[PDB]
Every structure is written in structure tokens, then in C-alpha cells.
Amino acid sequence: GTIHLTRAEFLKKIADYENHSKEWKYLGDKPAIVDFYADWCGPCKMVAPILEELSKEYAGKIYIYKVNVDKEPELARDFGIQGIPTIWFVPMKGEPQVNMGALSKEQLKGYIDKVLLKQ
């Protein structure tokens, strides 16, 4: 005959269907920096060059990504960006570390070595 179904049975017999929150999973093949910036941002200007430099000094070893929050509002919004710049240090495994505000080449490297490269 016809079979009667509880939500419980439904999960086992039809579909385990709830859209469970996705766990953080980095897809890059190298550690990376993610720099959320804007053009009306002050420090971001004195920092951009410092970044370009580190992108060479650690070329081959890390990626440095920049995101213009104005050109990508959905993304910035999805990630609760507030202080500018907002800087992300993303390792090949584990949660990103997030630093609200500007940093010096020294402090940056500190995070690049200690966090991106598990030094």
C-alpha cells in the first residue's frame, strides 16, 4: 500500500534536506592576504605600495588580493566589513585572522610569516 511519512523518516528515506550553514573552506593553493579597501580611504593609500612590495618579496609563496568595497558591496556586506581598510590573513587551513585598520610592513610581515606560513 501507500507508506506514511514523518519528517524524521523523510530525512532518511527521501532527502536530508536542511540547508546547513557552510563551513569555512579556503580554495586557494597558497595562503593569501585579502585587503578590503576604499578610494576615499587615507591609510589605504600609504599602504597600497607597501602591499605591492610584499607581493614581490613573497611572490610564489603567497597571494595578495585586494577588494574595492565600493565596487563589490554584496561581498563587503556578506562579510560585515566596517573599518577601512579591513585586512584578512587566510591560511591554507583554519579560520582567517582579521585586522581592523592599517598596518606597517613590519606588522604585516609579522602576520604573513607567523600566520600565513605557520612559521
What residue numbers does the annotated binding site cover? 18, 74, 78
Q: How many CB atoms are closer than 10 A to CB 60?
A: 7
Distance CA 48, CA 58 (A): 15
Residue at grid coordinates 597558497: 30
Q: Which residue has the cell 576615499?
A: 40
Does residue 93 belong to the site contacting a copy of itself (CB under 8 A)? Answer: no
Q: CA nearest 92: which of 24, 30, 23?
A: 30
Indicate which of Zn ion, a copy of itself, none lies near residue 17 (CB less than 5 to 8 Å, by partner kind): a copy of itself
Q: Which does 2 bind (CB under 5 to 8 A by kind): a copy of itself, Zn ion, none?
A: a copy of itself
Name which of residues 39 to 78 contact a copy of itself (CB under 8 A). Answer: 48, 51-52, 55-56, 63-68, 71-72, 74-75, 78
Q: Is residue 68 helix, strand or coil?
A: strand
Q: Does 78 bind Zn ion (CB under 5 A)?
A: yes
Is 44 tagged catalytic? yes
Binding site for Zn ion (CB under 5 A): 74, 78
Q: Any idea which residues carry the catalytic annotation?
A: 41, 44
